[PDB]
Amino acid sequence: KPIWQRPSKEVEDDEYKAFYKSFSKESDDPMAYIHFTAEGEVTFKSILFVPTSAPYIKLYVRRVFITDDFHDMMPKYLNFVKGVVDSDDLPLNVSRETLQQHKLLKVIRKKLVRKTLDMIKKIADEKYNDTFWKEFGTNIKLGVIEDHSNRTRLAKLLRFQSSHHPSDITSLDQYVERMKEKQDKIYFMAGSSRKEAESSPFVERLLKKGYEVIYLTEPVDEYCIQALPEFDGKRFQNVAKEGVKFDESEKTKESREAIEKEFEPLLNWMKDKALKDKIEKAVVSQRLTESPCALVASQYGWSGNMERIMKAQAYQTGKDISTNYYASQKKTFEINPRHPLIKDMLRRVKEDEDDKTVSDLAVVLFETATLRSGYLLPDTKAYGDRIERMLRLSLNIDPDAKVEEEPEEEPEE
Amino acid sequence: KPIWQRPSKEVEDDEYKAFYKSFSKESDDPMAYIHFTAEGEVTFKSILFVPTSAPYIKLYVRRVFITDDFHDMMPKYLNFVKGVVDSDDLPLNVSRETLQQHKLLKVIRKKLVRKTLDMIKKIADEKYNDTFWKEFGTNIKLGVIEDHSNRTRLAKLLRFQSSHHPSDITSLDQYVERMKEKQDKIYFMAGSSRKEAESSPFVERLLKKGYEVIYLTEPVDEYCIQALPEFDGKRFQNVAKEGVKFDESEKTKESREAIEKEFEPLLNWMKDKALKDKIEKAVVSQRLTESPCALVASQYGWSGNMERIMKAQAYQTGKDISTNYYASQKKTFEINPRHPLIKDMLRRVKEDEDDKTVSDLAVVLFETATLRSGYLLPDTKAYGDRIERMLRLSLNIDPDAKVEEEPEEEPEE
């Protein structure tokens, strides 16, 4: 009597563990397993396993070994799941092309997934984060993207890093638990490493104000969170895009609105002259603590991280998505109203609006902010020359009429 | 009597063009074809085609159709070659697992390739660059890397852009032809785009001096040129690495050597203090015209371009090659001996060696040169802050004792 045909309650814990090693060697235990029998439209018995490493599903029709080459048994992201499936409904006396393309095949596929996820839902707690996540956490994320129907089920299985603790991973449910009263957004920051994301300008105020930010350090991470509309009735919000709010009070609103009136000629100065055709608009930032300014993308446009991931993949694989869409779109330049540099810029503009010193500074500041916002710098040659021109003021060396002078004394050599 | 069994001289040009469309539709002509019979160790007849786009090799044993599922017939880079193969030596009646792993199979494969390249060698001249190159140029570059034995045959087929002309591609032979008398290196610069490679500081003097520099703007490009040791007795030289020479004369040598004695206390100053543990050594640059300084990688180290490509692929796929080797190696910092800023630096160091103003400037200059050299900036948060510190000097705003003040007047909000 095959291991999978006996009742669930009659099989020893040891026998399952012995069964797993029989078709994979390695001589070590699986992370988990479930033995179930399916009822309803399609009847079949099965045992599915979760190995302990990534570094294969046995099909049986009416108890007769058919194959295990069927790679479309599990969806892309569950290709690590090993086990047996013993149907008694499928056409036994047919071809392998016919059988793989049958009506009941797509049905069994879905039932296997829904059970696999039930198994994973029950992996202890301390063991989940310490084992399963560091091994197949990527698959869970891939699933959120691909498996639309089990999306909310998978959402719970997600684990990320957050501003709550320097290293520890957190679940989405845990985040929601820590949230502030009026807060209704799950704030997150995407990047190349935790150190980059936490250093970023976009999280500054949210942190100081006491909010929690999730750090996405993986390449797939932003796509994942992107394919997840809501979670427990809370919508997601990329701190590097437009969408951050701070409810406050009436007297607080009065102040901020009055600050925006004050800086208005400076914001129009950047929009119309200093950075014309460089930014979409200039506004007073609400997310900045100590940074002078940052570049913020539109709600459905590309973040700094997105632009990199896209360009990288389009360069390695694609055919130059240069004039793509929201790839070459201007960003919203946000400035910190309480920054010494921004305040001088306001005053000096209301005085001499055609002051090239401010104009050329605004550019250097913008381009530095371009790098700090995570976006690629268009022309590193020009930027380096603008730093050079300004560097030479900090010394004395005649800006224009010297970078020619000695650099062209070379005809002697 | 099949199309491939008749003599080469007896088959009409039209009939070949007709034969191509019969197994691929599309209703349009191929770019080139060759009909040949093989003599020697293994005998077979074959017609190979080069399609006009990229967006399949018919195997016959003793005129009997066998299959077209054999994807290991051509090497990876020639997967675009469509055609027929009619052997009479192969085991006719044997399994497909057997026949694919046979002795003579590896032999036929090499003959097919050597003939494919003979076909491509004969693609007119005007038609080669305008059509074939912009379609399969990449495969040629992959071949140089993969196909060792046909490497010198493939090298000639390579086409790149160069400083000789704004857009026109050039062959390697053409480059050799334009070379100077004492020149014995093929100078090239690797980048993300042409505009980037030509803007680079590394090409400055070589260009002024009259030398020609090849620009590599594709990801695979530097990997290609790297796997090619010599070409027509000329070794290659990456303008961004150590290796550039300028033969000159004795009185020229006297001057340069006398200059290296002059800047020595500034070179030791950078190495031992201002940039201690940042650079490997500071030297007097011979490749610079108008740039103040640049980072130069070792001979077989990673160039700026290399670093970017390696890091990207190691992020999209690999597991953080952070503690690799020549991934985290310090570069050689080269200064232009005739730059107003460098000259002030030398003078200001011989006087006050512990002048923090110079010490702090040399870092901003080094970091700007880090970006200009095509290298990744380690901590953009720090860099932005250093620019900010210096920006506020060009206004007045108390550097240390202000970036605290107003940026911490927020507790009122």
From Swiss-Prot, chains A, B:
Residues recorded with modification Phosphoserine: S95
Tagged with keyword Disulfide bond: yes
List of residues that carry N6-succinyllysine: K281
Domain of life, per lineage: Eukaryota
Keyword annotations from UniProtKB, A to Z: Acetylation, ATP-binding, Calcium, Chaperone, Disulfide bond, Endoplasmic reticulum, Glycoprotein, Hydrolase, Hydroxylation, Nucleotide-binding, Phosphoprotein, Sarcoplasmic reticulum, Signal
PTM note: Phosphorylated by CK2.
Enzyme class: hydrolase
Tissue: Detected in heart muscle (at protein level).
Subcellular location: Endoplasmic reticulum lumen; Sarcoplasmic reticulum lumen; Melanosome
Record site: Important for ATP hydrolysis: R96
Biological-process GO terms, alphabetical: ERAD pathway; protein folding
Entry's EC annotation: 3.6.4.-
Glycosylation sites (chain numbering): N93, N129, N150
Any one Gene Ontology molecular-function term assigned to this protein's record: ATP binding
Residues recorded with modification N6-acetyllysine: K127
Main location: endoplasmic reticulum
Assembly notes: Homodimer; disulfide-linked. Component of an EIF2 complex at least composed of CELF1/CUGBP1, CALR, CALR3, EIF2S1, EIF2S2, HSP90B1 and HSPA5. Part of a large chaperone multiprotein complex comprising DNAJB11, HSP90B1, HSPA5, HYOU, PDIA2, PDIA4, PDIA6, PPIB, SDF2L1, UGGT1 and very small amounts of ERP29, but not, or at very low levels, CALR nor CANX. Interacts with AIMP1; regulates its retention in the endoplasmic reticulum. Hyperglycosylated form interacts with OS9; promoting its degradation by the endoplasmic reticulum associated degradation (ERAD). Interacts with CNPY3.
Function of the protein: ATP-dependent chaperone involved in the processing of proteins in the endoplasmic reticulum, regulating their transport. Together with MESD, acts as a modulator of the Wnt pathway by promoting the folding of LRP6, a coreceptor of the canonical Wnt pathway. When associated with CNPY3, required for proper folding of Toll-like receptors. Promotes folding and trafficking of TLR4 to the cell surface.
Similarity remark: Belongs to the heat shock protein 90 family.
Recorded domain comment: The SRT pseudosubstrate motif associates with STT3A during translation in normal conditions, preventing glycosylation of facultative sites until HSP90B1 folding is completed.
Name of the protein in question: Endoplasmin
Full-sequence portion shown in this chain: 340 to 765 of 804
